[PDB]
Point group: D2
Chain length 196, copies 4
């Protein structure tokens, strides 16, 4: 039902866009030259290209549960290697957000079940290493926001230790940014962690 609506809406968007610019799709099929790799949360409220007000073809993206960057995870590392070594993107944006379900999960003391407890483990590690600080926050939603920000900082550290990324910094001046999307106001701010 909603799937068939999504198909209808795709055809509508494509038709309107094809009238707007008869050369838009033919140039799009020609290739891509995105300048940003976006790594974010799978959350439905975080479509990178919409919330940044940009166009198809300029944001190369990876999205997972709680925007977690893990050192040995091959899924994410493939996206990073292709983006940095092949597409030569100039910016890497690791984005956390408010009301993150994975963050909230890591703050909980229960088994979420299945694969998720293992996937969220580096966030739980972030929980344990800042437990003093997180527990001191009386407001639950601000606690979820805080652990999401700390998760961004950690993910940035991992990114700054990625060899493909550091080669690109050293030779091309690749930039890395940790940002936070606040859904309540719809704004994205810098957390102050990254290349400079």
């Amino acid at each position: 039902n909603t799937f068939h609506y999504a198909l209808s809406s795709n055809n509508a968007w494509a038709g309107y866009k094809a009238h707007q610019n008869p050369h838009f799709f033919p140039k799009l099929a020609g290739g891509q030259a995105p300048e940003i790799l976006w790594i974010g949360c799978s959350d439905s409220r975080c479509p990178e290209t919409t919330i940044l007000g940009m166009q198809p073809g300029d944001v190369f993206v990876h999205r997972n549960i709680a925007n977690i960057v893990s050192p040995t995870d091959i899924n994410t590392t493939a996206v990073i290697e292709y983006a940095v070594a092949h597409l030569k993107v100039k910016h890497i944006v690791l984005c956390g957000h408010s009301a993150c379900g994975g963050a909230a999960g890591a703050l909980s003391d229960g088994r979420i079940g299945g694969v998720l407890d293992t996937w969220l483990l580096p966030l739980k590690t972030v929980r344990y290493n800042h437990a003093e600080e997180l527990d001191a926050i009386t407001d639950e939603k601000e606690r979820v926001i805080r652990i999401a920000q700390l998760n961004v900082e950690a993910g940035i550290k991992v990114l700054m230790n990625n060899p493909t990324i550091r080669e690109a910094i050293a030779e091309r001046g690749l930039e890395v940014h940790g940002v936070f999307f606040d859904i309540g106001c719809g704004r994205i701010k810098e957390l102050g962690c990254g290349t400079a």
Copy 2:
């Protein structure tokens, strides 16, 4: 530079949206109820929410190199488990597309280097098992398109063998769809593989 422009454009989009609907962001921060899990390629030309002409909050998404669904990959499986067992999405859309870089990579005979040769291995396996058919296509771009379609079919098979997914089919009537986004015309079509 383009990063700072992306921030400006985010603030602009947020401002305009906040005038359009003063309750949009406050309800967004309230929670999510997406009805679709979208699994697609990291390609910058494939932002799911734009090409489907939808809004932030209704498409839960995972994106990787060449939209590959691997049986033991925990990154993807976390997104699937959270989407199906916790968000209770009603549709899963595995989307391949034309001019896929990973597909083209799998069609090549060279080492792409780093982690990518290992990540694309299930696509290379698709290459080998349909080598007769793929080699018979004289046009390179149509060969890339074909292997991308076959990759979608394979990923669907894996999805249909995921336990979390099949439980949801058996008890909730979860639907699974394999689709293909043709960048040249901007349209998404069904490949005819999935639940029904």
Copy 3:
């Protein structure tokens, strides 16, 4: 802590004995390694490659996981394979399945094993689905588990044979790949007839 401390004690005893037998055994061990076999097997306590092959420390390079599963995108296994084939230049890759495999039995049952295990065993569950007719027709439970474990070895061999490092090393060095089966009841290892030749 008792059994662990016993393990340390037995280590010290084994080291004392090995060192009296050959005073140059350990210094030569510490010099480097030149194993000729990469062993990929099940984590099963009953399957220690170096003991059952009656060989010595320094000649078998090994990776072991649940139900000896070789997955295409698994970075853990691929690292061991890459290091073994491209750095140590091993001449043989042995994928060894075995009888009474718990992971195999888990794949044959229809209940949730829980945690991460259903996902790890998913490619074995996939082998289950594609041979359901053959597997279900087997009246003996132990022979059904043995059979699904052997089919698992065959599948893993196919994956290894599609690995780029392995495939190149076959093409230029004559790297060999073998699918074998360790039958615990008789303690013997047989070839399954799948691999390089």
Copy 4:
């Protein structure tokens, strides 16, 4: 194929010998397993857990990878841990690092090792970066490799101690976790003083 066929031959000889020593050894082995130790170690050919601990097939459940690295999201290792702790109810988890570790040395060099290996070794490279002062001050290369391998054991222990299954099993069953180091030169295993107690 010679060395592989020799391995099959030696297996048959070992099985013949083990079967004459104890005619009930193999049938009892085939009945099931009750290992009390989960061993996590390096794939290194010089580190076969069951030999160096001087124990028998059926009492050590093992996972082995490059440089014995325990990564939080690695599903391969987590499967072995889950099966060992929640199904077999092992009482001890032994993370064993060793001397002359190739992965350790790889992490200490600054060149690309190539393929998947830089990514797998990334958490060891991370340990390198955080202890660069200590590691660089070591004049002896072999003691630098040993040191980074020990720090790697310590880090892996921290990860194991944050694992939910391990943590629960500690809380209710008194599961124990030990960080150890196998020094190949003398063939002895020592405790690093990191773990449950």
